Design a protein around this ligand. Structure first.
Ligand SMILES: Nc1ncnc2c1ncn2[C@@H]1O[C@H](COP(=O)(O)OP(=O)(O)O)[C@@H](O)[C@H]1O
Ligand SMILES: [Mg+2]
Ligand SMILES: [Mg+2]
Lengths: 50, 160, 43, 96, 70
């Protein structure tokens, strides 16, 4: 009845598509913005650096 | 949180790995602490739930204790090894609060790093914790309760 | 003047400059470890 | 033999590092451990006569003074031997 | 807890609060004596001290130096 020896299961998303649940991703997104924020932290002020 | 790795410096030539300084170290040390603190954060208390760790030979270990879960997690980072050996020191001495002492240390390094960014020295921060802890142990002595008017072994049962 | 001694050698002063910057590089690594406000160094 | 200048002079060096809040009772511990034990006057004052035993576990406050010598080694207990003995004379066996 | 610490020494009910708190099963405030939640005093003693020394060891670090293996 079957076409061959075995039949591997289908991944729902495409192979290599990154996905994650829970509170870890939104913390990573916030930490990503804070990482960009730290570059512009000492630039603020009339006594900042280029 | 750290990005854009430090440049190899030609004026300071040391054998082995490159030197790195600034606030990135305390950011990396806290980031290394969150790598282990988030592991033990979920398995705290009755409602807490634990995880599994395979031994790469089919065997695994479902562990609730903080000393056991950190013993199998061989942390290559230097700052994480302090908390790994602390739990091995905690469970041998007292055998209780192994998860809380790591969670307390992680929250301290979080807010301590925030205070260093607020431009107060760590020596003043450490002096603030020691005078606070000396009053805390004095307050722990105030809230003690001696077992009295208890029927049989009930105080040993409910505390277990 | 023209009769002054040129000394024919600029390599010695350049090597001394390379040593001073190399010596000041590691000296400035441990500058923040001095006094009560010093910081520890884990190697 | 002055416990005023020698104690506070040792705490100045301990304050530039770790372990300094507990230096109030480790500073005078350093004074008597050298002047009253190692050598009294000059020319000879030795640090190899001082012993520091490294041990994992415990807290920083647990460090205290011991009037006598402490052995880093432990008993065999293999045979059922005593591990404490009041009023015991200690003999050094240098053979097998 | 605050309403208990601030209170007069002479106030039974408020003082009692100093004794109770969070419950994880039913989700309400109940007495620990009747519930049976209790710990030793030694468990908290020398736990914050170990966490204190753990914080001191990392907090005092400024720079990190790594030597590659031979
Ligand atoms: N039945 C309970 N009701 C309320 N709190 C509890 C109960 N059981 C445990 N806890 C709390 O959970 C914390 C951690 O407990 P436990 O996981 O047994 O210790 P460890 O942190 O060493 O793993 C304790 O500080 C305790 O106050
Ligand atoms: Mg427990
Ligand atoms: Mg000194």
């Amino acid at each position: 009845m079957n076409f061959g020896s075995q039949t591997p299961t289908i991944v729902v998303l495409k192979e290599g598509t990154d996905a994650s649940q829970g509170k870890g991703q939104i913390i990573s997104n916030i930490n990503a913005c804070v990482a960009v924020q730290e570059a512009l932290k000492p630039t603020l002020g009339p006594l900042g650096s280029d | 949180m750290s990005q854009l790795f430090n440049n190899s410096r030609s004026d300071t030539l040391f054998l082995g790995g490159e030197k790195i300084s600034g606030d990135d170290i305390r950011n990396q040390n806290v980031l290394a602490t969150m790598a282990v603190a988030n592991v033990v954060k979920s398995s705290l208390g009755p409602v807490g739930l634990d995880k599994m760790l395979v031994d790469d030979i089919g065997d695994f270990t479902v562990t609730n204790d903080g000393a056991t879960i950190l013993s199998l997690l061989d942390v290559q980072h230097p700052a994480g090894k302090i908390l790994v050996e602390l739990a091995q020191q905690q469970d041998r001495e007292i055998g209780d609060g192994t998860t809380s002492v790591v969670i307390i240390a992680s929250e301290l390094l979080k807010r301590a790093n925030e205070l260093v960014k607020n431009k107060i020295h760590p020596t003043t921060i450490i002096t603030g914790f020691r005078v606070a802890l000396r009053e805390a142990i004095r307050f722990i002595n105030e809230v003690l309760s001696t077992s009295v008017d208890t029927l049989g072994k009930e105080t040993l049962i409910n505390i277990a | 003047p023209s009769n002054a001694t040129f000394k024919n050698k600029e390599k010695p002063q350049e090597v001394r400059k390379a040593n001073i910057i190399a010596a000041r590089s590691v000296a400035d690594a441990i500058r923040t470890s001095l006094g009560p406000k010093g910081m520890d160094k884990m190697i | 033999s002055d416990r005023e200048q020698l104690v506070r002079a040792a705490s100045t060096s301990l304050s530039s590092k770790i372990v300094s809040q507990y230096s109030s009772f480790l500073a005078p511990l350093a004074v008597d451990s050298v002047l009253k034990i190692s050598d009294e006057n000059s020319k000879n004052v030795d640090l190899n006569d001082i012993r520091l035993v490294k041990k994992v576990g415990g807290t920083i406050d647990d460090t205290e003074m011991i009037d006598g010598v402490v052995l880093t080694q432990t008993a065999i207990k293999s045979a059922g031997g005593p591990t404490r003995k009041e009023k015991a004379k200690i003999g050094l066996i240098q053979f097998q | 807890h605050a309403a208990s610490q601030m209170a007069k020494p002479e106030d039974v009910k408020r003082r009692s609060y100093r004794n109770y708190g969070l419950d994880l099963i039913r989700g309400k405030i109940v007495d620990e004596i009747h519930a049976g939640v209790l710990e030793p005093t030694i468990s908290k003693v020398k736990s914050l001290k170990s966490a204190l020394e753990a914080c001191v060891a990392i907090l005092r670090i400024d720079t990190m130096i790594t030597v590659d293996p031979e």
